[PDB]
Design a binder for this molecule. Structure first.
Ligand SMILES: O=C(O)/C=C/c1cccc(OCc2cccc(CC(=O)O)c2)c1
Ligand SMILES: [Zn+2]
Length: 258
């Protein structure tokens, strides 16, 4: 599997190896704010990241992942649309070549400069690989990034990116506090969907925050200096690693707020 984001291996090609690419609950989607309905039954959202244990940062050739110790209930997501307890395993971003594109979800067709995905798995399935085979196995918290003021809590991430420029490079990344990536408000939209990269599994409860975070142009520029390629290969900048919006089909996006 040689999937990527190029003309020859990008999202329009994925369905040949991963036919669920054309499925009934694919992500991302456009969030039409006028059509999403407030749902009073949504319980409050609980982001419990006080005991988060970050380990490592990895350039996987598609994005960079900040990996956590998920061997116990340290950093968990509960409440909102979720039943039970979801453990943080990793976060990563999707971003653009330019500030006008980069996010995977859109808001009334508006593209943000980037999108953060905090990935969590349902602890009733015991491990991540079992959780991704279940329709309620993952909860992904999605956070939009706009270019404006710098986000201080992001700077430790951007400062390490020089050490993982190319595919397969990793660096120790302990003691990173993902609380510093959150906006003030936890108002969100939620809908059932999928992973946005191969294998595109339909196992995700999406929770997308309404409030974007602001990052500086300097911060996002540093994202765009990463490489898709491995060391000693021709340089292909890691930009535009986003899948476009997919058909909503028979789904409703619910809002937690009026
Ligand atoms: O069928 C199985 O048990 C193995 C499944 C499997 C096997 C390999 C990988 C994978 O997921 C990769 C992944 C993790 C988190 C997010 C995303 C999409 C995104 O970029 O937001 C993808 C799942
Ligand atoms: Zn993602």
């Amino acid at each position: 599997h040689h999937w990527g984001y190029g003309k020859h291996n990008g999202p329009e090609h994925w369905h040949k190896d991963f036919p669920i690419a054309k499925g009934e609950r694919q992500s991302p989607v456009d969030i039409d704010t006028h059509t999403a309905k407030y749902d009073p039954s949504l319980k409050p959202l609980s982001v419990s990241y006080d005991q988060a244990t970050s380990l490592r940062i990895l350039n996987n050739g598609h994005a960079f992942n900040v990996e956590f110790d998920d061997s116990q209930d340290k950093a968990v997501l509960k409440g909102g649309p979720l039943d039970g307890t979801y453990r943080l395993i990793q976060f990563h971003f999707h971003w653009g070549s330019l500030d006008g594109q980069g996010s995977e979800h859109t808001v009334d067709k508006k593209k943000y400069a980037a999108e953060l995905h905090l990935v969590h798995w349902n602890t009733k399935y015991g491990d991540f690989g079992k959780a991704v085979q279940q329709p309620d196995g993952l909860a992904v918290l999605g956070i939009f990034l706009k270019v404006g003021s710098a986000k201080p809590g992001l700077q430790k991430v951007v400062d390490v990116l020089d050490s993982i420029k190319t595919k397969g490079k990793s660096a120790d990344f302990t003691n990173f506090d993902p609380r510093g990536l959150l906006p003030e408000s936890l108002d969100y939209w939620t809908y059932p969907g999928s992973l946005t990269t191969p294998p595109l599994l339909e196992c995700v409860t999406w929770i997308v925050l309404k409030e974007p975070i602001s990052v500086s142009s300097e911060q996002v520029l540093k994202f765009r200096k990463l490489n898709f390629n491995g060391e000693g290969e021709p340089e292909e900048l890691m930009v535009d690693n986003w899948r476009p919006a997919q058909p909503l089909k028979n789904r409703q996006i619910k809002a937690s707020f009026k």
